[PDB]
Scaffold this active site. Sequence first.
Site, PDB file in Angstrom:
ATOM      1  N   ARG A  77       0.846  -1.186   0.000  1.00  0.00           N
ATOM      2  CA  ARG A  77       0.000   0.000   0.000  1.00  0.00           C
ATOM      3  C   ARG A  77       0.884   1.238   0.000  1.00  0.00           C
ATOM      4  O   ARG A  77       1.696   1.431   0.904  1.00  0.00           O
ATOM      5  CB  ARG A  77      -0.935  -0.005   1.197  1.00  0.00           C
ATOM      6  N   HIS A 122      -3.371  10.950   0.364  1.00  0.00           N
ATOM      7  CA  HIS A 122      -2.821  10.767   1.717  1.00  0.00           C
ATOM      8  C   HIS A 122      -2.169  12.077   2.169  1.00  0.00           C
ATOM      9  O   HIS A 122      -1.004  12.116   2.592  1.00  0.00           O
ATOM     10  CB  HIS A 122      -1.857   9.572   1.739  1.00  0.00           C
ATOM     11  N   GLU A 167      -7.667   8.560   6.028  1.00  0.00           N
ATOM     12  CA  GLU A 167      -7.910   9.262   7.273  1.00  0.00           C
ATOM     13  C   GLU A 167      -8.423  10.693   7.111  1.00  0.00           C
ATOM     14  O   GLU A 167      -7.833  11.635   7.648  1.00  0.00           O
ATOM     15  CB  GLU A 167      -6.677   9.287   8.177  1.00  0.00           C
ATOM     16  N   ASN A 309      -7.771   1.881   9.510  1.00  0.00           N
ATOM     17  CA  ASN A 309      -6.507   2.134  10.188  1.00  0.00           C
ATOM     18  C   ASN A 309      -6.792   2.052  11.677  1.00  0.00           C
ATOM     19  O   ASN A 309      -7.621   2.799  12.202  1.00  0.00           O
ATOM     20  CB  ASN A 309      -5.977   3.528   9.853  1.00  0.00           C
ATOM     21  N   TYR A 311      -4.933   1.747  15.585  1.00  0.00           N
ATOM     22  CA  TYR A 311      -3.720   1.877  16.380  1.00  0.00           C
ATOM     23  C   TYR A 311      -3.922   1.715  17.881  1.00  0.00           C
ATOM     24  O   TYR A 311      -3.007   1.235  18.554  1.00  0.00           O
ATOM     25  CB  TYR A 311      -3.085   3.252  16.146  1.00  0.00           C
ATOM     26  N   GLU A 376      -3.699   0.112   7.902  1.00  0.00           N
ATOM     27  CA  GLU A 376      -2.598   0.497   8.787  1.00  0.00           C
ATOM     28  C   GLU A 376      -2.811  -0.096  10.167  1.00  0.00           C
ATOM     29  O   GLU A 376      -3.918  -0.112  10.707  1.00  0.00           O
ATOM     30  CB  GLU A 376      -2.474   2.013   8.992  1.00  0.00           C
TER      31      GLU A 376
END
Length: 472
Positions: A77, A122, A167, A309, A311, A376
């Site tokens: 990616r 991005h 995002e 994504n 985290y 991600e």
Amino acid sequence: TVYTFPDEFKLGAATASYQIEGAWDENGKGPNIWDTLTHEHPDYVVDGATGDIADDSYHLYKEDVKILKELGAQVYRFSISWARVLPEGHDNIVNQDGIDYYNNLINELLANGIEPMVTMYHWDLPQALQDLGGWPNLVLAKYSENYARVLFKNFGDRVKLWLTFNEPLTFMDGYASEIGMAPSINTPGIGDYLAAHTVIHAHARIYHLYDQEFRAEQGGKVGISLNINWCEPATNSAEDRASCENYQQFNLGLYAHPIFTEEGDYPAVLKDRVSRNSADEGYTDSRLPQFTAEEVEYIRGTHDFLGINFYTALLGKSGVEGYEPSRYRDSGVILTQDAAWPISASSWLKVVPWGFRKELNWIKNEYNNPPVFITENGFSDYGGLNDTGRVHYYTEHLKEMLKAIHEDGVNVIGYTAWSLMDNFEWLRGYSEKFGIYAVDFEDPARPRIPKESAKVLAEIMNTRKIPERFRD
Ligand SMILES: OC[C@H]1NC[C@H](O)[C@@H](O)[C@@H]1O
Ligand SMILES: [Cl-]
Ligand code: NA
């Protein structure tokens, strides 16, 4: 079984253009908002760092492919720099050097058995488009369509996995602070919502474009990468649970409700809370922009998969805090971190692997189990090759994801680690390291060298299982 990847599941790694490429003004590339931020406002960035060179992946893309091949990545990616392709932002000038660069990377990947997955946007908006107001100005939706057309036309014969945006929950915040993410504009609670609105419209235009002009011939899939933290109730009360639902809707639902539900539109709680707050503060009009019924219908269903994504997690409790106006204040949750959670090199990132499983279940239930590609997931430290914290982060998150798949029936279809290599970490400069490969930013050759996490991820990708020594 719970430790084995499904046969068709795709494993790999991820980067973004401004974070890795360098060559910021080389061979016709136009300026973007991160060029502007790092050049004009070095005081916003740790060490006054810039992406002028970064990993020098514009020159060193073959080295990136070499380390992907060593890793055993099935998918890479990466993102395309809008201003490298369309230096003026508008589609009047196409920079052949940019076309050539991304073709070279794509062809190198394919020659080495690695599938490209391309993020169109991005965070590196051409400055010429920011000068019109950037994302708060709805004219950018058509400009985004035109940019996507150039990408599909030039690359779509070989690229079958696309993400429109990465995002927007994050990059909309570039319109909610004078010192933050590019373009560093202070319109919290107003301009960030306008940015979100334009992004949603742009995403929908790009998806429809693919349907109309490219899908029959190219046969690929178009999604979007949305970030979301798990939000755990601070206590087991109904009131704290309500606040965590508010969080999900104000963070993920802002983008996913319009696109991924049958109903479409923004979540009701988003519309209602912002309407009420706006009225109470004396605005004639709600600060939240509106979709017409026709727009709601156009936007809903514009997806072939959901990119996530993931985290970290937060604790949520009932209440309201933050400045008036702001998305955080509107969201009606008080957010904290548990002091017991393991830390990283990033203030916002605590290690909460069970939150990943909870989030995947929340998504499954809210959006009727869409195919989910984890675009991600990763961990920061300040340096070092013996990156035991990162190894633990990956093995635990992958175990939790595998439980979501096998135990909970969540349709997760792929996973790309953030990041292939240490890179420019936005306002943190080169101070926070997310790579599985280390890069020496003081060495003009920018050598990439494997950390322990690269070795462990290679073992996982090769064996297609979590090694015994990392199992519970
Ligand atoms: O902050 C870590 C990582 N998270 C999400 C972003 O998409 C990526 O650009 C960033 O480097
Ligand atoms: Cl062993
Ligand atoms: Na073209």
